[PDB]
């Protein structure tokens, strides 16, 4: 049977080998064309370079800032609250479920999917729609 195994059709594909004659269709220039910077070894052009016209990444203005809170904040889907083990949905229980990473400080629960258990959400913010769904499944939203 070690002589009988074979990959799926489509699974394996021979790599492109430039510069092995005319028949291959990749002879001579190896699909680089004729002359110029781009045909040269190490001749790539930096993405965003536009021939020396003021690039798009400089003719357009910078805008905005990053809040620090954004970096320690995490939205939680209502469907994910399933994964929590126990009734109390808090930052520690979310972290234990790996729903939020351990550096998360602030959580908003959002109406995505459905809650099928009664959970008490303490400490976290909830959307009106999620609150409704929690309360509809016999949950509470503690403060």
């Amino acid at each position: 049977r070690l002589n009988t195994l074979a990959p799926a059709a489509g699974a394996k594909t021979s790599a492109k080998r430039v510069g092995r004659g005319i028949g291959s269709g990749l002879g001579k220039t190896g699909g680089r064309g004729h002359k110029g910077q781009k045909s040269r070894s190490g001749g790539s052009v930096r993405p965003g370079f536009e021939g020396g016209q003021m690039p798009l990444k400089q003719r357009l203005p910078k805008f905005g800032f990053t809040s620090r809170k954004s970096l320690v904040s995490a939205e939680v889907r209502l469907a994910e609250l399933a994964k929590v083990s126990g009734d109390v949905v808090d930052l520690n229980s979310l972290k234990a479920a790996n729903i939020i990473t351990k550096n998360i400080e602030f959580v908003k629960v959002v109406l995505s999917g459905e809650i099928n258990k009664a959970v008490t959400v303490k400490g976290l913010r909830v959307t009106k729609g999620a609150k409704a769904a929690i309360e509809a499944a016999g949950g509470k939203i503690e403060e």
Binding site: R1, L2, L5, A6, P7, A8, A11
Partner: protein, 200 residues
Amino acid sequence: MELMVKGADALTVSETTFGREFNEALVHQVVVAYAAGARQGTRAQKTRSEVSGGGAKPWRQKGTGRARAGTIRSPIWRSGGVTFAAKPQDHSQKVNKKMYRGAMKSILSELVRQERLIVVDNFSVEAPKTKELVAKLKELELTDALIVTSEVDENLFLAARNLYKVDARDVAGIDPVSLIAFDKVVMTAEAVKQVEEMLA
């Protein structure tokens, strides 16, 4: 499913483990990974930089009538570098845990259908003697066989060393290639049940 144990009654087994369809693309991938896993990847060639010498420009850029050279260790030159000299590689492939188990199940299923999986009630060798094991094998009418027990006795390990195409493996130590490689797979019924839990 039901497996016909010898020296006992038929053993009920999971149809997921022993009745799975044979996914050849899955088995082929895992088998290939395994073989890549075995590679050592210990080689190297020298590049122009790593070959001895080659600092000085062989002769002046213009005037000599010769083709321009910069180093006697150009890859063009005899005794020169390899343009793309190898260095030691890791040919290991990730296999997903489910993909490994899936392959393993596919293989065991195919063994069953091909009547290569031979379930025995027990398989023990009394002394650490090759000669005894050869006899036992002859009772089972198999010369080339992997012998999977729940735990490998010293005696059976020792009795199998000098035998070619006879390996004694614990359920832990069974591999995708070995199940394929040996002509028959002689499992003790305990080991069957252990393999079942191992593979889901």
